[PDB]
Structures are given as structure tokens and as C-alpha cells.
Amino acid sequence: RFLKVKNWETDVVLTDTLHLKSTLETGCTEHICMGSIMLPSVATKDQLFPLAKEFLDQYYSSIKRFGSKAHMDRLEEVNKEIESTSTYQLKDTELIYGAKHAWRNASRCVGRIQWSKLQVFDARDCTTAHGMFNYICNHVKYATNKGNLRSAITIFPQRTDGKHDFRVWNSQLIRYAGYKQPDGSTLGDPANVQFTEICIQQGWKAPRGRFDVLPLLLQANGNDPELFQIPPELVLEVPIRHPKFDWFKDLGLKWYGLPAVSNMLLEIGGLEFSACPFSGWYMGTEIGVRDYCDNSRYNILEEVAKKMDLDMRKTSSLWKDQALVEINIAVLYSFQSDKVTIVDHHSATESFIKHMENEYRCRGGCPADWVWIVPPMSGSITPVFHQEMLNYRLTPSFEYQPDPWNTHVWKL
Amino acid sequence: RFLKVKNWETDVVLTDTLHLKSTLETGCTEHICMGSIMLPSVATKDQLFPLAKEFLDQYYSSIKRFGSKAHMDRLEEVNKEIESTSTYQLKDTELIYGAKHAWRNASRCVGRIQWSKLQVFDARDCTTAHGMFNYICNHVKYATNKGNLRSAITIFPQRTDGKHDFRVWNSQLIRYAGYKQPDGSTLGDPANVQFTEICIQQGWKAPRGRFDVLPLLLQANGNDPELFQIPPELVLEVPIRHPKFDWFKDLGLKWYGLPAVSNMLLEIGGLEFSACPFSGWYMGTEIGVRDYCDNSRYNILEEVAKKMDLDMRKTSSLWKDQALVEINIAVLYSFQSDKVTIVDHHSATESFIKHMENEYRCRGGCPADWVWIVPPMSGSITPVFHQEMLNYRLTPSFEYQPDPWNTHVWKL
Ligand code: HEM
Ligand code: HEM
Ligand SMILES: C[C@H](O)[C@H](O)[C@H]1CNc2nc(N)[nH]c(=O)c2N1
Ligand SMILES: C[C@H](O)[C@H](O)[C@H]1CNc2nc(N)[nH]c(=O)c2N1
Ligand SMILES: CNCC#Cc1cc(C)cc(N)n1
Ligand SMILES: CNCC#Cc1cc(C)cc(N)n1
Ligand SMILES: [Zn+2]
């Protein structure tokens, strides 16, 4: 019940007790493990006070006033307000705590050593999509900080009945457009083709190129969403060059500096924040491995092998591997020379081992998803490959949610 | 109950029903996933006939005589023999079926497309360690086949009381010695230092070098084990050279061509074969990534970076990654030019996707351990990264077992 995890590179063993406080279900059973399944699987008052109480007991245990009068009266207060409204409202201090701990609990995030340095932007007074555009722009400008990136989250009003939802329809605040072609191939980013089409359906006029930043599709209070274009001066981009290969520029590649996930759901004390865009800084491999070399993404291993002069007829020449390293040396090199914050997969995985140590020490554990923590290249030469990890679901949490254009009781 | 697994590169979905026949427990619960834990965790007659019956019902269902008289009388026969002896003996046909399906069921093995082409060597008449040495030598010579490697397993007598166990004490039939140093560092293979010491404790005279093949430590019928040296003409080795870098030879590296795991336990119909050495052929990354570049193994990334002239002061120069690719191009190149069978991680992972397809088609599923199937470099540019997999325990199976020098009621 009080399980051990080993590192098979350093022989370090650590004991996990945190998993006892785990609440939600993982998808695994005693007879089947779903640890590699990507997405395994309205609320009433009777369900809502337990979740409220559990969250408040840990918040007040955190500020070292567990059981004081201020705790007891807040308990009473929220119970009464859930009696009164069949929902409730978080204190500002509770929102910041809940948001910081949703990140802390995010078992798929290798970056969590930073979890206590999160800037929280309270957007619960927002009422319109223009208001959301304005809040989001302020978030982008703050988090970018001239390339000295800063972690931030903006939190729009919580779900009420369920038909009044605030939603950012984009999967990230800043993504490149995806257009198919007459010849069937694809320009830009194939991941976003169905989303790019929706933007044009709502009247986006597309500069049908490669690295065309997409417009925001913001839905406020369950209303049909509206398009807004981020001031291009606010979208910071890094041109990608190699520190040896001068033909690299002719590839004409760039990426955006701000990774900002906008499609997930923030759960705190039982309340559900359906729009909660959050940003940090990139680990290089997200760009250089997945974005650039996934077969169903930009898929550029072809032309980097070509302009490197490689044995491309033989699978066993490892020409794919060798081009993959050069691409990631360049992504890193270009961000660094521009003073735009980026972390390499060696530094980031070392920090997560160090973070894990602190979590077992002063928290009794750290939920971690090995399938997602291990980088998507050079896995075993980073220390997280050799680190056993336990995955379990703690709350506050970030959860997946359906794409809104499948939920929306649209009125057009 | 009848679960689906998706490939997020090709959008292919396949339905798993095989997991229903799963029997053993995984280590996961509804509230915690142990999919990254390496080793999660005598027999009576009452337990033994169910296992015997379950195995026989699938064997006879396999040869398309489910429920015939030959099935019914074999059922009766084995029941009577477990009444008589409180154990039983497999038919030759049943041993070959059981061994081929233990491999088929091995969820951590990416090579299983070959599972039906296994040569089974029945060594259940063996009574002495010399006999084991002789059986093992015949296995090594057959499986090597002049570099045209052939899959094989040799099966020594099954466990009886438990104090009469046949055991190969080495973890692989062919491993390099591991000696520490006065200055604390290590020559050879640090993985094997405690085993190499045991060999010297039993009187092995060590050529204290790097690539010194270790002697066999064979235990027969629960007796104290004995040392035997494999005729060096039978240990095929590949000298590792690079197809571009001529300084590669000066590194003076070689590896053995035959991967042959000797420390696991083969379970069939409830019977336990504690010595069952089995061999195939290498996937390059086992040598070039893990054996050579694991920090606690040969750990040669240092000198390959050095003789490549690389930016070794900066973690973010990806000098480790870039040296790692060249090492694996060389491992492959050297094996191929010597006509010694080897598979690259791209070909082997493609074949396992194809194998998975056949298993869902004609078997209803394929148990697979993602954490182990994904190669330890370049993970996401191989198709198994993007393939969801279900892990569950089917029998016949290969299981881990304690190291014998911790179990053995030694009489010296
Ligand atoms: C500060 C620097 C950060 C770094 C270096 C980092 C690193 C990463 C990486 C590499 C991933 C994997 C993404 C993928 O493979 O698609 C990830 C996922 C994730 N991160 Fe972090 N992150 C950072 C900040 C944050 C912040 C500020 C939050 C929330 C407030 C967060 C929460 C998450 C979540 C929930 C996921 C999973 C998203 C998904 O399932 O697609 N991270 N992070
Ligand atoms: C024919 C070519 C084969 C290839 C290319 C292959 C490939 C692999 C690889 C890469 C591993 C991972 C080893 C590690 O990372 O330590 C593995 C493990 C394994 N293989 Fe296969 N294999 C082959 C044949 C076989 C055979 C003949 C058997 C049994 C009869 C087998 C059963 C297993 C088992 C049980 C494991 C897990 C061992 C462990 O947990 O350390 N394989 N295989
Ligand atoms: C902690 C982790 O489970 C451990 O390092 C595993 C990960 N995956 C692996 N996969 C393979 N094929 N071989 C290994 O030794 C390991 N090691
Ligand atoms: C099938 C598999 O779960 C899927 O491809 C996962 C594997 N691990 C991952 N890990 C990260 N960080 N990001 C991903 O998109 C994925 N994809
Ligand atoms: C599909 N998830 C995409 C992503 C992402 C991500 C998000 C954050 C906050 C940081 C980071 N380094 N990456
Ligand atoms: C720790 N397991 C080591 C191993 C191994 C192995 C075994 C077989 C049969 C084939 C292969 N390609 N590799
Ligand atoms: Zn699991």
C-alpha cells in the first residue's frame, strides 16, 4: 500500500505514500494496463460539497491553519453557498493555490520543477469574446516577456448549467494553419486542417502559406464563437538556423516561442473551468522531434537527409536518426542565440529527477507518466528512462475535454 | 470489456478481446498504474490440474481437435498422473507448443513476428552440469549457424520439490566479464561485477581484460553449480567499425552475436522450467544504445564525442545524441558486413506493427508493453511510439525469478 520506485541507473529507491490520497481512476485494472492509451475513460450539489471540502482541507493544511476558525467558517460558508446556489465561488487565494496544484499534479508534464512559479490571471469577470481576446492578448504579452518567457494561466468563468461554457476553440493559443491541396498533399500543419477549415467557415481569409498563425476562436457564455487575430507584434517567432550547416536557412523554418495549451479543463474543488489557457516554455524536442518529424505533421526528415547527403535507400543507415539530431541542435541553437527561453531534453529531464526527489521528500510522492515524461529521442541517455514512476490522479487537475465543435448546440 | 487501441499516426483502430483470457495480475489497480515498474509483484496438486486443463484445452483447440476423444483422454490421463505423482509430464508436442506460445505472449518482446519459428531442444533427460554444458554448447552452435542466426530454446528438467532446481546462474549464456579496479573504476562490463566475482569464488581464473567471455555456472538437480568454458570457436563475435570514421577501430570494440537469455523461468500448464536458455538475434540498439552508452554499463559516449570533436561543455549541444547515432550506424554496419544477423530498430518496430495486426486479426489481440517495445533512441520516428498497446499476462509465459545465489541452500 506504501509502494517503492527504483532508479536503475543510480540504485536510488524512494517510497510513495502520496498515491493514497489519489481519488480518480486510472483506466488500469488488476488484469490490464492502459498506461499507453492516450485518452482513457453536469454536476449536482450532493457531489459538490465533498469535493469542495476535500479541496479546502488541503488548502488550509497548506497555509498551516488546518482546523482554525477561518477554516471552519469557510467550510460552513461554502456549504451554505452550495445550499444557496447549488455551486460556489473560489477566493482569489484559493484559485491561485488550485491552479498551481493542478500543474503540480499533471503527471504528463516534465517541466513541473517550476510549479510554484505560476502567474495566475483571474478572468472570471469576463463576459464576452472580445473580453476574452483582450485577456488572452494580455496573457500572451506577459508570458512572452520579450523572449524571457514566464509561466502563466488565464482562468475564464467556471461552467454553470453546462450550456453556458467559455471555450477557446483552438488547441493552442498560437498554432500554424493547416491547408490541404488539390493534389491531396498538405501545406502548413496537417494537425490543424479541420480547425483551419472551421476558421474559414466562420469567415477567416487565409494567406494559404506554411507558417500562418491561426486566429483565435473564442466562445463566451455558451455563445457561438467569434474570430480575432492576435496582433502579430505579439506573436514572437524564432527563425531556425544551424550552427554549422548554412543551407539550413534555405529550409526557411521558424517556430513560435510560446507553447500555450488552450483546450483542457481546469478542475478545482469540484468546479470546472472549461477555458483556462496556460503557457510555459518549450522543450526543444516538442518542436524538433514531434512538430518537425512526426510523419503526420511537418514531416521534414526527407529534406534534411537530402541536403545532408545521406544513404536514404537503406533503412539501416540510420539516416532518419542522424538528421533528427541535427534538427534539434538547430532548434536549440536558434532559440538560445535569440535569448528566447528553451530547455533541452537533458536539462529538463535532469530537473524532473531533482523535482521528483523533492516531491517524495516533502510531499511523499510525485505522480508521473513514464510514457510521456521520457523524451521522444535519445530516451535512455536521459535519466528519466531509468527511473520507475507511479501514475495516479490527484486533484486539482488539468483534464481533457471534447472538442467544442462536437458539443456545441450551435444556433446557426 | 472489449477494448480498442488506436495508432495516432495512421488512425488505425483495432479491438482487443484476447485480454479476456488474461489470468495473472499486472500490478496496476483502478487507482495506480505500475506500467514503468521493472519487476512488479512450491505448488500443490489442487492448483495444478486447473492450469493443466486450461493449457490442454487451448493446445487441442490449436490443432483443431478441441473436444475429441484424444483431448478427453489426455485430460483424464494428466488428471490421473497428477493424482498419482502430484505433478505430470508434457508430451513433446505440448512442450513445443507451450514454448512457442510463451514467446508469443512475451509482451516486452518486439521480435515476436517470428514466434512460430522456434527450434525447441528437449533437455528434460539431463541429469548433470556436464550434461547441461553439452546441451548448451549444442544450442549455441545451432543458434549461431555461422552468423545466420536461428531462434532456439533449450529446456532442462522441470522443478519438482523446489530444492532440486536446474539453473543457469549466468543472466545470458554469453556475457563479458566485469572487474572493478583499485582506483574504484571498472574494466569490462559493470553489470556483471558481482557475477564475475562469484565465478572467481568458484575458482575462475580471470584474464582481467575488457571483452572476456564469462564461464557458464550450471546447477543441476539442486546441486552446487560448476564452471565450464564455452569453446571459444563457438562464441562468434563481431568487431565494430564505422563505415566513415577510421578512428573507430582504434576504439577496439566488439560484441557477441548471440543474445541468449538464461535467467528466466518458463511456465507451461502449471509446470515450471527454471532453466530454459533462449536465443534470437540482436536489435542494434540493445548493443549500441544500452550496452555501450548506459551510464552504468560501458559508458563510451565520452570517447566517441572526443574523437568526433564535439562541443562537450554544453549540455544543449546534443553531443551525446550525435555520438549515439554514429555508434548505432557502426554496430549495424559491422554485423551486416560479416553476414551476422541483426535488425535495426526501424525494421524491427515496423515488423511488430505488422505482427500486431495479424494478432488482432487471427487472435483478437496482442499483449504489448509500450515502455519496453519503444526503442531507447529515436522513439517517435518509429511507428511503435504512436501505437497504443494493452498489456496483460497470458500463459504459457516467461517469468522473472530470483538470482540463484540468493535462493540456494548452498552446502559449502
Ligand atoms: C515552464 C516550462 C514547462 C515545460 C518545460 C513543460 C514541459 C512539458 C512537455 C514537454 C509536455 C509534453 C507536451 C506534449 O508532448 O505534447 C508538457 C505537457 C503538459 N504540461 Fe508542462 N511544461 C511547462 C509548463 C507547464 C505549465 C505552466 C502548465 C500548467 C499550468 C503545464 C501543464 C502541462 C500539462 C497539463 C501537460 C499535458 C498536456 C497534454 O496532455 O497534452 N506545463 N509539458
Ligand atoms: C528472433 C529475434 C528476436 C528479437 C529481434 C528480439 C527482440 C527483443 C528485444 C529488443 C528485447 C528487449 C531486451 C532488453 O531491452 O533487455 C527482447 C526481450 C525479450 N524477448 Fe525477444 N527477441 C527475439 C527473440 C526472442 C525469443 C526467441 C524469445 C523466447 C523464446 C524471446 C523472448 C523475449 C523475452 C521473454 C524478453 C523479455 C526479457 C526481459 O524481460 O529482460 N525473444 N526481445
Ligand atoms: C524504469 C524503466 O521501467 C526501466 O528503465 C526500463 C524502461 N524500458 C526498458 N525497455 C527495454 N527494452 N529494456 C529496458 O531495460 C528498459 N528499462
Ligand atoms: C500511443 C502513445 O501513447 C502516444 O503516441 C503518446 C506516447 N507518448 C507521448 N509523449 C508525449 N510527451 N507526447 C505525446 O504526444 C505522446 N504520444
Ligand atoms: C499537446 N500538448 C502540447 C503542449 C505543450 C506544452 C505546454 C506547456 C505549458 C509547456 C510546454 N513545454 N509544452
Ligand atoms: C535483459 N534482456 C536482455 C536481452 C535480450 C534479448 C533476447 C533475445 C532472445 C533476443 C534479443 N534481441 N534480445
Ligand atoms: Zn497500468
Explained architecture:
The structure is a homodimer of 412-residue chains. Chain A is α+β, with helices and mostly antiparallel strands and 412 residues long. Chain A folds into 3 domains: 16-124 and 151-161 and 265-279 and 349-373, no CATH class; 125-150 and 165-236 and 400-404, no CATH class; 237-259 and 282-347, no CATH class. Helix content of chain A is 33%, strand content 13%. Chain A has helices at residues 45-62, 69-85, 92-104, 129-144, 193-201, 284-293, 301-306, 319-337, 345-362, 370-373, 404-407; strands at 3-6, 13-16, 119-122, 152-155, 167-168, 178-180, 186-188, 216-219, 226-228, 237-239, 254-256, 260-261, 265-268, 271-273, 278-279, 282-283, 342-343, 397-399. The interface between A and B is large, with 67 and 67 residues. Zinc ion sits between chains A (28, 33-35) and B (28, 33-35).
